[PDB]
Ligand binder design. Structure first.
Ligand SMILES: COc1ccc(S(=O)(=O)N(CC(N)=O)c2ccc(N(CC(N)=O)S(=O)(=O)c3ccc(N)cc3)c3ccccc23)cc1
Length: 286
């Protein structure tokens, strides 16, 4: 009884360790087991009903280090269990899942701007690297469609990117797709109805509120209704046919308003507010 939206970690004056869940049907908010380590800039995904916390940059009383950690949360036990860590720390990471395999895309290790991606086999609890991206990307958004991994926007070390690349697992290669109309760093990327949505983000001069979706059929970026709040480093997921944007940062305050986008109406609604404003959260639904 209840498929939930999960928010894990985040930042607000100090990277948080909170794990909270939102039930859209009734609007309730749930406080669950906190992360063993406060983390922000991490990404979230679910494989086999299990929630995974990947990457980010964790708080410590002995430093503020880029985390290569992979942690697994079981809603049934409300208990976090650490898994095998990634080869290298990845902060500002994008993660996409293909057949129960977790793809870690880009991310930063201090000044190192990763272009390498590694995949995780949950059953073996092992990470193995694959082909690296054509471009270095941190703050990149990752989305999987028809068993294809799309990495969009980000920062390559000197430029904020509007380009996107596509990973073909069968060929194990990266192909550059038509770039977005807008440069987006720390934007929200998700898939809905054969379309990759890029929501919000940072273009280099100001946090964005516009949203443009990429139509796989045409392979072209088209603008849709923009969001009511400008946000960057936002959490994003789709839940029962609607896109959900969680929190983010507008350039002034750490936001918490959650906005819902309806494809059929092409309108944004503020469905709820979170317990506390936060940014750089990982988001997943299960
Ligand atoms: C110091 O103030 C803070 C503002 C936000 C946070 S945060 O917790 O949200 N956070 C986590 C972390 N730092 O690891 C993040 C911060 C910035 C990001 N960008 C980098 C990129 N595009 O490469 S950004 O483009 O969104 C951007 C650029 C400039 C401004 N002014 C704001 C945002 C992130 C991208 C992805 C994930 C997390 C990000 C913490 C402190």
């Amino acid at each position: 009884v209840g498929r939930l939206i999960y928010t894990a970690g985040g930042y607000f004056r100090q990277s948080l360790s909170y794990l909270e869940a939102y039930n859209p049907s009734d609007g309730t908010w749930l406080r669950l087991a906190d992360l063993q380590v406060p983390r922000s800039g991490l990404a979230g995904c679910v494989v086999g009903g299990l929630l995974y916390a990947v990457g980010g940059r964790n708080n410590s009383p002995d430093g503020n280090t880029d985390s290569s950690a992979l942690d697994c949360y079981n809603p049934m036990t409300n208990q976090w269990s650490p898994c095998a860590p990634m080869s290298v720390p990845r902060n500002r990471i994008g993660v996409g899942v293909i057949d129960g395999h977790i793809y870690a895309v880009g991310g930063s290790h201090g000044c190192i701007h990763h272009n390498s991606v590694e995949r995780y086999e949950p059953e073996r609890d092992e990470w193995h690297l694959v082909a690296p991206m054509l471009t270095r990307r941190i703050g990149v958004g990752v989305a999987v469609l028809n068993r294809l991994l799309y990495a969009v926007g980000g920062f390559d070390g000197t430029n904020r990117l509007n380009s996107a690349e596509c990973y073909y697992p069968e060929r194990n290669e990266w192909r550059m797709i038509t770039a977005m109309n807008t440069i987006r760093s720390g934007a929200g990327v998700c898939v809905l109805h054969n379309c990759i949505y890029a929501a919000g983000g940072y273009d280099g001069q100001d946090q964005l509120n516009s949203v443009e979706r990429y139509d796989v059929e045409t392979e072209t970026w088209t603008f849709v209704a923009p969001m009511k709040h400008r946000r960057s480093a936002l959490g994003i997921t789709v839940h029962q046919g609607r896109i959900y944007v969680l929190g983010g940062y507008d350039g002034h305050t750490f936001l918490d308003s959650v906005e819902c986008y309806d494809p059929d109406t092409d309108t944004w609604s503020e469905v709820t507010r979170m317990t506390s404003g936060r940014s750089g959260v990982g988001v997943a639904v299960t």
